[PDB]
Amino acid sequence: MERQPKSLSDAVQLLQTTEIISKCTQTIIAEWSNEAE
Amino acid sequence: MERQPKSLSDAVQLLQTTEIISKCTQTIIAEWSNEAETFKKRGAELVLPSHELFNAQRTITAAIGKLIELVSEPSVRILEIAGQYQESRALYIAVERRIPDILASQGGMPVKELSSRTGIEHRKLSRILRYLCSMGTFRQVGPDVFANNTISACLVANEPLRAYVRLTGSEAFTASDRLPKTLLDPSTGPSYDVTRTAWQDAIGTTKPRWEWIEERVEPDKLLDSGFHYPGIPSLILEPQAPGEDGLVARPELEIMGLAMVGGGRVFGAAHVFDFPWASLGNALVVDVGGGVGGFALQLSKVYPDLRFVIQDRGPVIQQALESVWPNENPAALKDQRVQFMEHSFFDKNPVEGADVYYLRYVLHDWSDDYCVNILSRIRESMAPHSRLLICEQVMNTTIGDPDLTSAPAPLPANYGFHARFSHSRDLTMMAAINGIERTPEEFKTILKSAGLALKQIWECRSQVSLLEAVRAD
Amino acid sequence: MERQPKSLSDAVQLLQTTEIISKCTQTIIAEWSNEAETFKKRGAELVLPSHELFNAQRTITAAIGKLIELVSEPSVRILEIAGQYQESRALYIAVERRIPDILASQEGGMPVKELSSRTGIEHRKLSRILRYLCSMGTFRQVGPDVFANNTISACLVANEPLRAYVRLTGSEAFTASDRLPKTLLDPSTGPSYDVTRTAWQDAIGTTKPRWEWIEERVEPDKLLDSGFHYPGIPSLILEPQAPGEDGLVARPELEIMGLAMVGGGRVFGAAHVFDFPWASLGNALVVDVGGGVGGFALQLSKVYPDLRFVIQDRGPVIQQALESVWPNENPAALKDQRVQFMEHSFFDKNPVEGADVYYLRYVLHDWSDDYCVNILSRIRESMAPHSRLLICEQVMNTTIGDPDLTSAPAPLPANYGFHARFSHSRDLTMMAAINGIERTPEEFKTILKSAGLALKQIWECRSQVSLLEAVRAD
Ligand SMILES: Nc1ncnc2c1ncn2[C@@H]1O[C@H](CSCC[C@H](N)C(=O)O)[C@@H](O)[C@H]1O
Ligand SMILES: Nc1ncnc2c1ncn2[C@@H]1O[C@H](CSCC[C@H](N)C(=O)O)[C@@H](O)[C@H]1O
Ligand SMILES: Cc1cc(O)c2c(c1)C(=O)c1cc(O)cc(O)c1C2=O
Ligand SMILES: Cc1cc(O)c2c(c1)C(=O)c1cc(O)cc(O)c1C2=O
């Protein structure tokens, strides 16, 4: 089995989901602080 | 002249502009990836960008243009514009000798063997192709060894497109060279006459150039028949073949007929999809001044219920039947879906009450007097349910137009650089036939003098738009 | 022709170059603010970008080019390039009728009808010429057919050397370009590198190097169409010159060329005044071979007060330097004999022996290689052991880099692509007019070693034009 080159879509979604992960982190931190209060 | 300090506003807009480019890149790659998934499943994908992608290309080009204006040294930038015509020539030279087609025939090709198959000398031809490579056309892969790149690839097996380059680089160039002198001479300067243009000054003739292309000339006189116009450059090595009457047609006639196919498929492809043609049922469109009918070709593939008649001058209708439609849709000629008519659109429209009269890149070839007559002869044959669609640049400016959508600030409302092609063609029409590319208000007045009202402007995935016209009734 | 899918690598470099564009923006605004700080307190400020600002503009221009190559629809981009010569015409027409100067006379803008009356262009046509330029960032539209200068066209106000350069590119050079395809394919013109068989001789229909055609005295009725296929300077139809004492008129192109190289020298040749250690020479003699009117002695004289100059060119060019250019831009330098002029043909032995520096700017590129090694051999025969010959020319790089020139970062073209567009435009001007050649380092080495000279250093400067420093192989 040989390794395959990654596609344009693989790159674009890895960017999009990383950006989703990063937006979710800010929400989670905000709501941890609301929850704690 | 001394250098000036830049202002706060230069910096703030340079930032705002840079952030716009950065948002556009994220949109562009997102829509490249939706394109990839749609290309794979398989329509419109293969002819033109998505709406979201088209707005991103148009906006980022507008931002590119404004970034150059804000970061450049003014004088550097003035002298770059002043000499940038040599890149038009370099491309013309490379495209004239079918260099795209040649490199696609092979890891790259040595320039010495590129010289052999073009007739251009190898040391000089290196410098034309590294000009192009430095500007993103073609690639250099080795020591004076060259290949097609992502941009030049679109010319391989593309005679309609190659013809368009050849048209812009042959007659239009000499008309352009003599266009300053024509604008200032007190006699030619004010004129809007089709026969007193920079082009006539170049050719040493008085006849409208639609008929100069159609002259039949003998071989010993032909290569310098253009006077100050050098002529198609390839004739020196590729003499034209005499026809059955012993005369040769002039190369520019076959080029122009095919050029408007090429040009129509680049900026006129949008109109095949962002107007509801399917909703007309089985309709008949009359392509007045249709040339070879390149746009009937673009529409015929997609809406099988439409029927056509192409109206133009004998020789192009002729070239359409004997070399173009045989090889581009022989089935349309067997089914009588397309009928042809040698016709001068200065005469009453021979086909009455048709669904659509299509008139594209016909009004921009004439000043206002000629346009009002052609528009009335079309309408003299329209029924009240008939629709006239003209496909032309509806020119906006850097400060916007009430009836056209403006770009975001700080960008020019007309998207600046995105419209560079419309302005290049504006000066071609001024140089060759005293034509005019028109603003919405300038279109409105010439339609009310012909007894038509502007029903809607169709903004599409092109700088070129559609004007739909009614009868004043 | 169908539209192709974009590849992973296209996306990745479009991101990479966008991030380069974004970093260059932060460098540029930082250095705009340091530049501002240099302007208020007051030098080099008024002539040159700082090193940091120049590297950001060059980088950011290179990235611009590659972003356009990556985001454009290929056929759209092919036809935009194909027609981009019309923007050259628009700028030429505008500058030839001194529209920058007319708009600076008000600046709330000027109605185009009143602009039309002062240019000779018809107002509705002149509207389309100015909106072409406005969409492309030259001039501004401020109202319905009301126009004004912008930050780019402003540098043309009261700038005759720069206007002269625009005029030179749009006059003889344009028609020479038009005939350059037919010249390249004809089997007789195609291979020659002779100064007398170019597209330009074909346009004018003459058999003389172009240097002396511009120096003719023509009869008043013969001058406007004296250019044959070349239409001539457009303004002559409206501003005829009165015959002089011999009943003849000069060709406008002579003085346009003289001032154009002053203008061009101040845009692209300004770097060489500051990125070469001239002050370390002390009180030295620079001989400006082919110095033209002496535009480069003008730039150096203001800054290094201890250098002495002699400007060498053709008689008529010298006299323009002495009668109109230097009287009006540095009269003290002549009255002190700091600058001397000398009518000289650089195909002969140079009369000046043992000078410190022989400056030769934009001369080697006007001739093919045989003439060039003759011109360098002429100087060499006259150099002292401590003498330095400085060639100021484009030292051409390529999109794939050169061992002796610094390459742009990846993913950019190694020669910074768009940043070098002017150098390539002039490369084709040299082919069309003089059969000249803009040259790579390897091609310069071959003619320097044929002339008995050695290249000691390449000077990369805040310009796409550089300096080649040569001594004799001794
Ligand atoms: N008097 C006339 N009668 C008919 N057709 C004419 C004409 N004068 C010019 N034409 C045609 O008008 C066309 C203008 S170019 C437009 C071609 C076509 N509409 C397209 O977009 O592909 C040319 O093909 C030319 O042959
Ligand atoms: N045979 C010759 N002998 C001397 N100078 C010559 C010459 N033929 C051309 N020239 C000069 O060579 C110069 C080329 S343009 C360079 C001008 C100057 N070095 C500058 O950069 O401003 C022109 O000024 C022209 O007058
Ligand atoms: C010399 C010359 C004469 C013309 O009539 C045209 C052109 C050039 C031309 O380039 C052109 C381009 C185009 O997209 C549409 C046109 O109708 C045209 C033209 O009509
Ligand atoms: C028609 C023509 C003839 C020339 O000899 C030159 C030019 C044009 C020209 O544009 C030019 C520009 C420049 O920056 C330096 C030059 O030596 C030049 C030229 O020498």
Protein topology:
This is part of a larger assembly, with three copies of chain A.
Chain A (H helix, E strand, L loop, with lengths): L7 H29 L1
The structure holds S-adenosyl-L-homocysteine (2 copies) and 3-methyl-1,6,8-trihydroxyanthraquinone (2 copies).
Mind explaining what this structure looks like?
This is part of a larger assembly, with 3 copies of chain A. Chain A is mainly α and 37 residues long. Chain A is 78% helix and 0% strand. Chain A contains 1 helix and no strands. The first copy, chain A, has one helix at 8-36. Chain A is rod-shaped, with a radius of gyration of 17 Å. The termini of chain A are far apart. One 3-methyl-1,6,8-trihydroxyanthraquinone (EMO) is lined by residues 168-169, 172-173, 176, 200, 210, 261, 264, 362, 366, 426, 429, 433-434 of chain C. Chain B: InterPro entries: COMT-like, O_MeTrfase_dom, Plant_O-MeTrfase_dimerisation, SAM-dependent_MTases_sf, WH-like_DNA-bd_sf, WH_DNA-bd_sf. Chain B: Belongs to the class I-like SAM-binding methyltransferase superfamily. Cation-independent O-methyltransferase family. Chain B: S-adenosyl-L-methionine binds at residues 289-290, 312, 344-345, 360.
Which structural class fits the helix and strand makeup of chain A? mainly alpha
DSSP summary: helix tally of chain A: 1
Question: How can the largest sheet of chain A be summarized?
Answer: none
Which percent band covers the strand fraction of chain A? under 5%
Note the gap between the termini of chain A.
54 Å
Shape label of chain A:
rod-shaped
Spatial extent as radius of gyration of chain A: 17 Å
What is the element string of chain A, with H for helices and E for strands? H
